[PDB]
Amino acid sequence: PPERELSRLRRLYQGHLQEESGPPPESMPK
Amino acid sequence: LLSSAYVDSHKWEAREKEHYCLADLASLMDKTFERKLPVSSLTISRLIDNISSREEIDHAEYYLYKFRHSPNCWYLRNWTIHTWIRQCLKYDAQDKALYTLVNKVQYGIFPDNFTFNLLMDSFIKKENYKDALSVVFEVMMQEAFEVPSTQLLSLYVLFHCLAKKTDFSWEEERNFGASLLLPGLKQKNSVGFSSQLYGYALLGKVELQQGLRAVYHNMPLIWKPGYLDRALQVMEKVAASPEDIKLCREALDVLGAVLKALTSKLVEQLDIEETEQSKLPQYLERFKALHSKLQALGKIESEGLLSLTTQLVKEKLSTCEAEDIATYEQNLQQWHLDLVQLIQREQQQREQAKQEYQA
Amino acid sequence: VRPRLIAELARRVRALREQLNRPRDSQLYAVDYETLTRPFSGRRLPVRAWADVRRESRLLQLLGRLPLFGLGRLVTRKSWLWQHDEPCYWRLTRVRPDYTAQNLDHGKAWGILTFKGKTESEAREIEHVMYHDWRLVPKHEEEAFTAFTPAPEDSLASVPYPPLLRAMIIAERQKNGDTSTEEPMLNVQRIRMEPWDYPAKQEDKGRAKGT
Amino acid sequence: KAYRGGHLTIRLALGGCTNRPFYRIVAAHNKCPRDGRFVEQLGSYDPLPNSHGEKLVALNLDRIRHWIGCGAHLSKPMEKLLGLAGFFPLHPMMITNAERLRRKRAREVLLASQK
């Protein structure tokens, strides 16, 4: 997502956030 | 500050009035309320028209309160509000008019600009500048700066009060800043721009010290940060403005003092946007640069704000008053027409009811 | 069939007593700000609302301080301001205040909606009037607040069919003799995806029953 | 029987025995019991791998299309089954759960490497 939308969500959910997740692995890790 | 012609109550005194005893109308409305039925706007109009004493002011205040808390609260007419203020002025009851205006939610008193001017000028003639300031703040809360006479009177009162004020509570800063910004935006002269600058400086101080919610909450102000930037933009606008426009040295000194003092709960702003507390140093640098630029361009006025506003008032208030008096006469005529239509409707309904009852 | 008349009598009496003992908005939508519960029913508000309930204003908390209850003025919502960058607001056309309220801070409202810069044709009832989420647009800011340049809203007109359904469509085509090679496509231009926070129909919404 | 409101929905009714589940894909009123009255049986689903290592799903696609075209809803497991069959798009949560499992397995692999 764009950084602006991530910041909008971070404002919407102040104090109730988890660590941001990046892109997932391209394949299933073996 | 207003002429006797503007304040003259003769033409309102000459309005066609149908006479009643206030006690009778009061008892009729008491019965209506006891039966949990709606009261007509004509009935409250008749009660307010028939105040003949200072104690009838006390009774009419109670019945205005009762009407506001009734199903037909919306239908309280403009002529009724005007008559209420006129009666309060007539029977030496300005405190009651001010009380109802302050608690407008409880009483439904929303005056037009003519009526605001009447109340404010009564307070000004009696040199009761505290109550005049209260009336100005009520005008600000109602956003009723659409008439030049009100703008000029409010600016005069505000600068008069600020000329002798040292201790500022943040609520007082907020009220003063809003009340100077709103009429300052409608006046395209040196006084208007200086008022814009001064009000933006005050609101920016309030924002930086207390937060933006303290500024916009329950105020006729926007929820966007950057009031100090808007003050700097006013300075920039004056720089590129014609020759006649200038900025008072006092407004610039106030902005400089605010910046010098500033440079020495839910989060409403996105974390990617820069805060104002971090842009303070750049605001200070911009202020110094623009101040030098204006001083070079000769766009700084050495006259005080109160004197300049007095001079502008003396120049413009006469023509503003002429326009206002013309509109007031038009309003009185339209009100007379509407009132006679209401009376005719009531009479027709009553006669038809009698015709039905005769069967 | 032996008649059951007590049932009809009770139904009619209950209907009359419900229509005559209607709870008013000042009673239904009052809130205790210390505990954040509805005194009428005792139920607590959801956690995600708590902060707003203590910071924001109800719509008629704003409209009761205006002449004519603010007809023709523009009102927006805090949630809209946070969520959307395009202007979202109501232009008020009719207001029915709850006169029983001590401060006339409860009631109903009608208006014309502009959501994300798109104005509707007709005026309808406003929902969530009792929410603590409302802000009043200043008159001197309206021109700046209302300004909106409609961006080009070019979205997908068609999408592929799901794999098995596409395979079945092609197989049926080849069975019926058609040998054309154009891919089957689902047209999605007539399916407009409405944002979940778009104002709903308040006229179709129910009301809390007295108790 | 007249239910207050309600609608038809295509869902999974559970039969079989203890520790041996089996599902019938049925179109039924949402207010009806899980294993109770239904309008039509639209298929079956055996979640236990058979001797060939297969989970057998039967879908009456013609009747499923008919009932969807008559206003029937779908339960989330049925939507996921139809996505797996290729009849529907993959449900968003299959994708999201796959991504979550990928991340979890990546964390486990990183733990092994760190050790």
Tab-separated table of C-alpha atoms in Angstrom, chain C residues 5-201:
chain	number	residue	atom	x	y	z
C	5	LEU	CA	-60.353	-12.227	21.148
C	6	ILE	CA	-58.084	-11.545	24.134
C	7	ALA	CA	-55.108	-11.878	21.793
C	8	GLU	CA	-56.520	-9.200	19.475
C	9	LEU	CA	-57.381	-6.952	22.420
C	10	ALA	CA	-53.863	-7.282	23.826
C	11	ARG	CA	-52.267	-6.635	20.434
C	12	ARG	CA	-54.309	-3.465	19.921
C	13	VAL	CA	-53.689	-2.218	23.470
C	14	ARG	CA	-49.957	-2.875	23.122
C	15	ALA	CA	-49.864	-1.000	19.812
C	16	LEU	CA	-51.676	1.973	21.345
C	17	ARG	CA	-49.444	2.022	24.432
C	18	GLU	CA	-46.317	1.819	22.267
C	19	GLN	CA	-47.528	4.680	20.067
C	20	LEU	CA	-48.418	6.790	23.132
C	21	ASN	CA	-45.396	5.989	25.343
C	22	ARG	CA	-42.823	6.445	22.571
C	23	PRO	CA	-39.330	7.066	23.981
C	24	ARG	CA	-37.860	10.305	22.674
C	25	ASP	CA	-34.419	10.881	21.193
C	26	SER	CA	-33.297	12.768	24.302
C	27	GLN	CA	-33.988	9.560	26.251
C	28	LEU	CA	-32.849	6.916	23.755
C	29	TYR	CA	-29.565	8.548	22.713
C	30	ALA	CA	-28.433	10.098	25.988
C	31	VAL	CA	-25.016	8.945	27.192
C	32	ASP	CA	-23.165	8.918	30.508
C	33	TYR	CA	-19.730	10.202	29.528
C	34	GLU	CA	-18.050	8.885	32.691
C	35	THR	CA	-19.011	5.232	32.121
C	36	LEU	CA	-19.900	5.492	28.404
C	37	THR	CA	-23.216	3.654	28.762
C	38	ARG	CA	-26.738	4.456	27.607
C	39	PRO	CA	-28.807	5.289	30.726
C	40	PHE	CA	-32.003	4.290	28.901
C	41	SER	CA	-30.928	0.651	28.458
C	42	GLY	CA	-27.692	0.389	30.454
C	43	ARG	CA	-25.753	-1.047	27.506
C	44	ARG	CA	-22.164	0.106	27.058
C	45	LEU	CA	-20.971	1.615	23.790
C	46	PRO	CA	-18.294	-0.189	21.747
C	47	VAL	CA	-14.706	0.552	22.723
C	48	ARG	CA	-13.718	1.965	19.327
C	49	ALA	CA	-16.248	4.795	19.787
C	50	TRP	CA	-15.227	5.843	23.306
C	51	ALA	CA	-12.692	8.534	22.413
C	52	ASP	CA	-14.983	10.118	19.832
C	53	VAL	CA	-17.880	10.145	22.291
C	54	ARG	CA	-15.699	12.260	24.590
C	55	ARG	CA	-14.317	14.639	21.932
C	56	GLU	CA	-16.789	15.120	19.078
C	57	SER	CA	-20.272	16.647	18.896
C	58	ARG	CA	-23.658	15.387	17.784
C	59	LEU	CA	-25.260	17.023	14.764
C	60	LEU	CA	-27.944	18.924	16.652
C	61	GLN	CA	-25.458	19.946	19.325
C	62	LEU	CA	-24.226	22.058	16.396
C	63	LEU	CA	-27.579	22.904	14.811
C	64	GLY	CA	-29.200	24.146	18.029
C	65	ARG	CA	-26.730	27.052	18.136
C	66	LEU	CA	-27.666	28.365	14.673
C	67	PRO	CA	-30.542	30.457	13.276
C	68	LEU	CA	-33.285	28.345	11.686
C	69	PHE	CA	-31.423	25.317	13.104
C	70	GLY	CA	-28.776	25.802	10.422
C	71	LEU	CA	-30.803	25.237	7.261
C	72	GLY	CA	-28.633	25.462	4.159
C	73	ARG	CA	-25.362	25.026	6.056
C	74	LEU	CA	-22.759	22.355	5.323
C	75	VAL	CA	-21.962	19.674	7.904
C	76	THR	CA	-19.260	17.011	7.624
C	77	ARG	CA	-18.127	14.136	9.836
C	78	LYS	CA	-14.813	13.463	11.543
C	79	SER	CA	-14.703	9.884	10.254
C	80	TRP	CA	-15.213	11.129	6.693
C	81	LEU	CA	-12.464	13.722	7.140
C	82	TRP	CA	-10.025	11.081	8.374
C	83	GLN	CA	-10.951	8.360	5.879
C	84	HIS	CA	-11.451	10.352	2.658
C	85	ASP	CA	-9.455	13.154	1.046
C	86	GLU	CA	-12.323	14.249	-1.206
C	87	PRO	CA	-15.037	16.485	0.309
C	88	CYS	CA	-17.896	14.634	2.004
C	89	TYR	CA	-20.760	16.600	3.532
C	90	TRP	CA	-24.495	17.160	3.890
C	91	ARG	CA	-26.299	20.323	2.787
C	92	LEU	CA	-29.173	20.629	5.245
C	93	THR	CA	-32.698	21.232	3.941
C	94	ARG	CA	-34.989	20.288	6.845
C	95	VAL	CA	-34.507	19.769	10.590
C	96	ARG	CA	-36.920	18.393	13.204
C	97	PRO	CA	-35.510	19.168	16.675
C	98	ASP	CA	-36.382	17.120	19.750
C	99	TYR	CA	-38.055	19.849	21.794
C	100	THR	CA	-38.000	17.666	24.922
C	101	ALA	CA	-34.197	17.892	24.976
C	102	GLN	CA	-32.952	20.324	27.607
C	103	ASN	CA	-30.450	21.877	25.168
C	104	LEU	CA	-32.331	20.948	21.960
C	105	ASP	CA	-29.346	18.748	21.113
C	106	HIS	CA	-31.320	15.766	19.758
C	107	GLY	CA	-33.511	15.406	16.699
C	108	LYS	CA	-33.648	14.525	13.023
C	109	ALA	CA	-32.292	16.096	9.839
C	110	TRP	CA	-32.681	15.936	6.061
C	111	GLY	CA	-30.276	17.099	3.394
C	112	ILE	CA	-28.501	16.609	0.090
C	113	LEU	CA	-25.418	14.393	0.246
C	114	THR	CA	-22.097	14.968	-1.489
C	115	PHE	CA	-19.859	11.933	-0.954
C	116	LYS	CA	-16.288	12.099	-2.254
C	117	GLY	CA	-17.298	15.095	-4.359
C	118	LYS	CA	-20.357	13.449	-5.977
C	119	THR	CA	-23.602	15.262	-5.196
C	120	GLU	CA	-26.888	13.367	-5.124
C	121	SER	CA	-29.988	14.481	-7.013
C	122	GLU	CA	-32.518	14.513	-4.146
C	123	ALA	CA	-32.598	15.310	-0.432
C	124	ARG	CA	-33.112	12.429	2.004
C	125	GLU	CA	-32.963	11.788	5.730
C	126	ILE	CA	-29.550	11.860	7.410
C	127	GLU	CA	-28.410	8.807	9.365
C	128	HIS	CA	-26.105	8.742	12.392
C	129	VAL	CA	-27.451	12.120	13.526
C	130	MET	CA	-27.028	10.992	17.146
C	131	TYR	CA	-23.372	9.988	16.671
C	132	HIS	CA	-20.627	12.102	18.225
C	133	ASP	CA	-18.927	12.566	14.866
C	134	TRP	CA	-20.151	15.864	13.408
C	135	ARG	CA	-18.434	19.128	12.442
C	136	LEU	CA	-19.836	22.354	10.994
C	137	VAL	CA	-18.157	23.905	7.945
C	138	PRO	CA	-17.515	27.651	8.491
C	139	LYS	CA	-19.151	29.972	5.978
C	140	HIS	CA	-15.833	31.638	5.120
C	141	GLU	CA	-14.301	28.195	4.437
C	142	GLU	CA	-17.127	26.669	2.370
C	143	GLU	CA	-15.663	27.708	-0.985
C	144	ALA	CA	-12.350	26.098	-0.047
C	145	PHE	CA	-14.047	23.066	1.500
C	146	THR	CA	-16.434	22.379	-1.388
C	147	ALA	CA	-13.821	22.710	-4.159
C	148	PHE	CA	-13.305	19.438	-6.023
C	149	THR	CA	-11.935	18.566	-9.460
C	150	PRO	CA	-13.427	15.228	-10.640
C	151	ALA	CA	-10.515	12.927	-11.406
C	152	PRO	CA	-10.828	10.491	-14.340
C	153	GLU	CA	-12.588	7.474	-12.837
C	154	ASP	CA	-11.576	4.856	-15.396
C	155	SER	CA	-11.844	1.408	-13.796
C	156	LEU	CA	-11.889	-2.101	-15.222
C	157	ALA	CA	-14.766	-2.729	-17.614
C	158	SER	CA	-14.297	-6.512	-17.746
C	159	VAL	CA	-12.500	-9.275	-15.849
C	160	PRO	CA	-11.689	-12.911	-16.710
C	161	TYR	CA	-14.084	-15.673	-15.798
C	162	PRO	CA	-12.958	-18.110	-13.076
C	163	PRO	CA	-10.916	-20.984	-14.560
C	164	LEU	CA	-13.488	-23.796	-14.437
C	165	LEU	CA	-16.356	-21.531	-15.496
C	166	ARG	CA	-14.294	-20.178	-18.400
C	167	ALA	CA	-13.458	-23.741	-19.431
C	168	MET	CA	-17.135	-24.718	-19.332
C	169	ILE	CA	-18.161	-21.670	-21.384
C	170	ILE	CA	-15.548	-22.434	-24.037
C	171	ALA	CA	-16.494	-26.119	-24.080
C	172	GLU	CA	-20.163	-25.262	-24.619
C	173	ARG	CA	-19.196	-22.850	-27.402
C	174	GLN	CA	-17.158	-25.503	-29.218
C	175	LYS	CA	-19.980	-28.003	-28.700
C	176	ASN	CA	-22.458	-25.657	-30.399
C	177	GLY	CA	-20.109	-25.284	-33.383
C	178	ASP	CA	-18.768	-21.819	-32.572
C	179	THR	CA	-15.007	-21.614	-33.181
C	180	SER	CA	-14.385	-17.973	-32.244
C	181	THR	CA	-11.254	-17.339	-30.181
C	182	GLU	CA	-12.328	-14.318	-28.091
C	183	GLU	CA	-11.871	-14.869	-24.369
C	184	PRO	CA	-15.070	-14.999	-22.277
C	185	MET	CA	-15.266	-11.916	-20.065
C	186	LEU	CA	-17.364	-10.800	-17.095
C	187	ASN	CA	-18.573	-7.231	-17.525
C	188	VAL	CA	-18.101	-5.331	-14.250
C	189	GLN	CA	-18.835	-1.744	-15.331
C	190	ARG	CA	-22.455	-2.004	-14.151
C	191	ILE	CA	-21.302	-3.331	-10.747
C	192	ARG	CA	-20.321	-0.167	-8.882
C	193	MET	CA	-18.580	-0.978	-5.596
C	194	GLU	CA	-20.015	1.404	-3.047
C	195	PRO	CA	-17.761	2.360	-0.092
C	196	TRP	CA	-18.866	0.618	3.090
C	197	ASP	CA	-19.146	3.965	4.918
C	198	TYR	CA	-21.491	5.543	2.365
C	199	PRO	CA	-24.626	6.955	4.062
C	200	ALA	CA	-27.451	4.420	4.103
C	201	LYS	CA	-31.224	4.923	3.966
